[PDB]
Amino acid sequence: LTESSTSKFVKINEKGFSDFNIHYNEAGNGETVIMLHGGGPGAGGWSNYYRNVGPFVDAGYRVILKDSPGFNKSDAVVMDEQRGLVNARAVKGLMDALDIDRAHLVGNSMGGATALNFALEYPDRIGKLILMGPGGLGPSMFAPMPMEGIKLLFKLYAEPSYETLKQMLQVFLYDQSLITEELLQGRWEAIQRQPEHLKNFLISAQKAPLSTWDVTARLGEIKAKTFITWGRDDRFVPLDHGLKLLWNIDDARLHVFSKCGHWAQWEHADEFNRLVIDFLRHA
Amino acid sequence: TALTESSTSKFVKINEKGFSDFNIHYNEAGNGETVIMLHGGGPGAGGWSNYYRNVGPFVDAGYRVILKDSPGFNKSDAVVMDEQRGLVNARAVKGLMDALDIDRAHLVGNSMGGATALNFALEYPDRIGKLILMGPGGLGPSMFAPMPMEGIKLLFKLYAEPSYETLKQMLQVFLYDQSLITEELLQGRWEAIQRQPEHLKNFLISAQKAPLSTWDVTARLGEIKAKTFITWGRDDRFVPLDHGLKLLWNIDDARLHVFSKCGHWAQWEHADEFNRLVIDFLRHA
Amino acid sequence: LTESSTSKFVKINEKGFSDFNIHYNEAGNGETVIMLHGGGPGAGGWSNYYRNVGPFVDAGYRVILKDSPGFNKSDAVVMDEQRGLVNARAVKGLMDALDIDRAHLVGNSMGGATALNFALEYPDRIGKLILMGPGGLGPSMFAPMPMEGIKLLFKLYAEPSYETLKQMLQVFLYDQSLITEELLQGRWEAIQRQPEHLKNFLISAQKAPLSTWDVTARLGEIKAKTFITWGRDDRFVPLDHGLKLLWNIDDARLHVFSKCGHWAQWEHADEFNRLVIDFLRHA
Amino acid sequence: TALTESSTSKFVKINEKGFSDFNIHYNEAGNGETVIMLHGGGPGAGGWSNYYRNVGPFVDAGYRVILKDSPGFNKSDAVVMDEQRGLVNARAVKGLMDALDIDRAHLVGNSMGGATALNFALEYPDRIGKLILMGPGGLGPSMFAPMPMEGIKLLFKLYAEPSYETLKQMLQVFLYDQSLITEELLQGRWEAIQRQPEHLKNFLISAQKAPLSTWDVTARLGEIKAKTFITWGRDDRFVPLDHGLKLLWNIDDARLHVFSKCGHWAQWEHADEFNRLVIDFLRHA
């Protein structure tokens, strides 16, 4: 499987979306599993889950790596509401235009916020819920905020540069040796590729700061089976939020990887894949 | 042969520091890599009672499974210990391995058994494979839970004043869903208490000689190089959830899994999930 | 100062209150400080703050030890709403009939929930906010619930007895030697004195379980200077809620006493008094 | 005499384990019970710089205040240490007390100074009065914060590549309200770095000989009998808030106070509150 071989597009229509073009990568048959990427500059479906797409399709699943509105190859956009909620509406739209009643969700950071919102708004359209360091869960009980990674994230959005990108990555990953010239230059080009997304993201932040993302109060509503994962060494989202989800979502479980940053499905792809696939198959 | 408590029941004499021709009872089945499961420290605890929902699946997965009765518990010989139990128990595990010609073994440890497993990993690093901890005890104070915790108070109350009712109360506190307690579970455990009364008295004499605080091996966790899998019940009223974090941060290569709607016994209350997760860990980690 | 010498009554009129008689103990002149008791059987204004009333009045404060509706000498009542909110309405009523525009609040357990609700509903009628192991803050991130103390609390309400009372007290206090025959028999008589309160409390619990008490979502609204105290060894309310309040209430501080149960103002009266009086005078 | 940095500036030669006629600089004023305040470990740290917002109020409250410059910092003599700094610094505090005929002293310690105070309480229990800890360092891993923390990364970066800009960045990370940084605070600290460059190099050589991990005295906290007051900034990006809990649970008689909207320096960013709380503790605890 490759980026282009799975590259596809589709227009959607929802509350705040009218003939909006959404990009994504598809492969495999069976139950549908929609993986949602984070909110960092240059983020995208394939770039974030290219190490999970293969194993999951083999496991007999229909994998869809979706590009959220205002990211990668999906159309640009400015949001007046918390991205979590808006992103979820975009998800429903993609499954409607594509005719998909049920879908398993896998979401990291912004993707996790999106997944949480989707489960709250459309509980009848979601299968199992998988969260990897989801964002927008309010204050941490131990970590000063904004967290290290968040400060670098906004810094990168407001003042894009190779240097700042690297600094963000060094804080993004636990094992510094994983930061290669290929990875650096790779995402570097992605950011410069579509600057409009960077500015639009910042404008949206103005309209809806992270505080409008906190859906903690509605966690008791989610009834979908949930699997929470966290990198023990995540400098972007607080580890204690993993406990928050574990205690407030009726049926959930928590798995924490050691020597792991904010990119668990990538830094510990093998264990992540085995765990989630096992979770989807037997849970 | 059918796999039952009786069909798997065996005994072996061990020799090690503090042990001379000491009889250890255990339940064994299967062939392949060795997995020794170590039980908790409550009155009436034993290998079979702790792990009867796990032995079958592990054997079927291709492992040689040994459910060991630690010294001073169930069918193993009686003893009054003057040293911390985790260390003494660890010496017993080595003694059993030596006696059965087992070079290396994966360890699964619950509570006292978890402390035992940690001591084993520290004292005999070349004799252990992977390390599985299920709510290990003796790791010192909690950063959030007042101590002694509910489960510990009932454990000591049962040791001093054994009764069927107090046993039921302790089991209830150790669970998330108290309705899961069966008449058969209670009866089996009550019989273990009634039929080996000396173990309760000896445990208390031992506890006075070596308080639970002497079980704390936190300071040496950084020495453990065995790949470790830590499991905890989100609703454990016996040992503190934050100790799972303590282990996750201090042991070099570990991962932590917390089960929701689960009391202290993750291996029992969430047996299927526990079995799948641990077997996957042993096979692919 | 004594119980009777400060014993007083007063009728109030609020949303769910019409000519409702509220009891309390008063002494001293100056700024008004209203202390609210916990929700355990036999609880009451004087019985819970008799070690703090003296020092505070001397500090130049007008101290009012209020009996919440359905407790001690105040009229009986059955609530259909979370007690925190109802209790706050009773507080406003007491200050209205008594003509008190501003008041400093000191609340333990149920009293803390009451204080939080009052600050949220009537922010223009509160001075400084002092919380001591306040209840109704949702799930704990570490403590299994119901907590040890809560189980004994309900056990005592449903099946009143000398034995259960003692067991509750042993879990209520850190230092077991403080449990004397005088204290035991003392509160024992108080409980049996008015059984109607016990049954009414249980009925109210049916109408509004602890889940309707969680006002966490509105903590960001409180602007009153807040002082949070917690017993390190509290087996009734989770220590991590102290951090919850510290992070969500704009201007707060946290003090944790070691070797201390769920009755901080009593178990560590001297330090508690110095700290809070200093807080009221200089904060 | 007016109380200024210069008017309080003094020097004393000390003799102790590892010290022979070693010159220690300190700032002193007041009379009464002795309170020795120990500074943090960042480049340019010193007694006056750490505590100039506290010395006046403490002296006015009736205490003899000594703001000590630890070995290898500010105006005290240079040194390359091969043992953990907290212990070596503690020996220096005793040396200073012996040289000045001070029998017992209350200690206030920030960061490295907090580690120093803990070591002092452990090694010389009969020479300490009350113990005040303000964000003490070297207490091992955090149960929640990834390490090294932001403040630690900047501290080591400044030690290796000193610059005014990196100094400002470090100070910003150590505060909650970054706008509180003044030109005078930065200039004073920058001068301490520029005028004693050897301290930065010696600190790094010392750190290689005795990593921060050797500073961890967690295992002995139960030995401390001094009444202890632990203070922490809720927004400390240098040392973890949960270590405040660690101290609260392991030290026999302690209390914990956490300031909101406060970075690492509770004594500086919330000076008035800190002064009132600590003075009340020394007087009535």
From Swiss-Prot, chains A, C:
Pathway recorded for this protein: Xenobiotic degradation; biphenyl degradation; 2-hydroxy-2,4-pentadienoate and benzoate from biphenyl: step 4/4
Record site feature (Transition state stabilizer), residues: 109
GO biological process: acylglycerol catabolic process; biphenyl catabolic process
Gene Ontology annotations for the cellular component aspect, listed alphabetically: membrane
Top-level taxonomic group: Bacteria
Active site location: 262
Keywords: Aromatic hydrocarbons catabolism, Hydrolase
Enzyme Commission no: 3.7.1.8
Residues noted as binding substrate in the record, renumbered to the chain: 39-40, 48, 108, 177, 187, 263
GO MF entry, a single one: 2-hydroxy-6-oxonona-2,4-dienedioate hydrolase activity
Reactions performed catalytically: 2,6-dioxo-6-phenylhexa-3-enoate + H2O = 2-oxopent-4-enoate + benzoate + H(+)
Top EC group: hydrolase
Regulation affecting activity: Inhibited by 3-Cl HOPDA.
Disulphide bonds in the chain: none
Record's subunit section: Homodimer.
PANTHER family (alphabetical): MONOACYLGLYCEROL LIPASE (PTHR43798), MONOACYLGLYCEROL LIPASE ABHD6 (PTHR43798:SF5)
Role description: Catalyzes an unusual C-C bond hydrolysis of 2-hydroxy-6-oxo-6-phenylhexa-2,4-dienoic acid (HOPDA) to produce benzoic acid and 2-hydroxy-2,4-pentadienoic acid (HPD).
Family per record: Belongs to the AB hydrolase superfamily. BphD family.
Protein name as annotated: 2-hydroxy-6-oxo-6-phenylhexa-2,4-dienoate hydrolase
Organism (species): Paraburkholderia xenovorans (strain LB400)
Organism phylogeny: Bacteria, Pseudomonadati, Pseudomonadota, Betaproteobacteria, Burkholderiales
Gene from which this protein is expressed: bphD
